[PDB]
């Protein structure tokens, strides 16, 4: 359910601090509005209002219309702006990171075994892996800057 992992889910850039603060403030205020308000419809005390009204058939007609149906400021799920953006973000940020993590793990596993293995039989092969490991260090610095 993560304040511990939700605030550190972004990258090294500080541009996501404004978007993460707006989503956390709207989510906390939405839960407090539903808990402070009553989860019932309406009381409509018509047992003591019909006999105490001055005009005849005044409180009885207003109680039948208020207990039926009325209008509210609601909307439907037709304007799914964030639903279409969530699927497109997974193909450019989540799916693209899978190929980068697979190439980084395969290059690091081959460089660890070549650095510990001799100097004529398994050397020329270790020199080729050392060139890819040296280029990986420059690519990692270019991806962070």
């Amino acid at each position: 359910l993560d304040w511990t992992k939700i605030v550190s889910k972004l990258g090294l850039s500080g541009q996501t601090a404004a978007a993460l603060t707006s989503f956390k403030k709207r989510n906390d205020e939405a839960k407090r509005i539903l808990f402070e308000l009553k989860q019932q419809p309406s009381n409509v005390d018509f047992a003591f209002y019909k006999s105490t009204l001055k005009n005849t058939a005044i409180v009885d007609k207003i109680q039948s219309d208020v207990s039926k149906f009325t209008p509210s400021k609601a909307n439907l799920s037709k304007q799914l702006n964030l639903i279409e953006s969530f699927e497109a973000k997974a193909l450019e940020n989540a799916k693209e990171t899978e190929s980068v993590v697979l190439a980084e793990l395969t290059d690091l596993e081959k460089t660890l075994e070549n650095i510990e293995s001799x100097x004529x039989x398994x050397x020329x092969x270790x020199x080729x892996x050392x060139x890819x490991x040296x280029x990986x260090x420059x690519x990692x610095x270019x991806x962070x800057x």
Partner: protein, 51 residues
């Protein structure tokens, strides 16, 4: 003087053999220690970048 020159140079060559090997530790043997320290630092940086 030919016999004294061969006996004197044999003792100086024995002391120079121990000094040439000891002085090579900061150049020849130091290259293996420097490459091992650079490879260990590069392996920690590659493991941190992959993680």
């Amino acid at each position: 003087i030919l016999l004294v020159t061969f006996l004197g140079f044999i003792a100086l060559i024995s002391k120079t053999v121990a000094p040439l090997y000891g002085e090579m530790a900061k150049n020849r043997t130091d290259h293996v220690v420097g490459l091992l320290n650079q490879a260990r630092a590069d392996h920690v940086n590659a493991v941190k970048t992959r993680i």
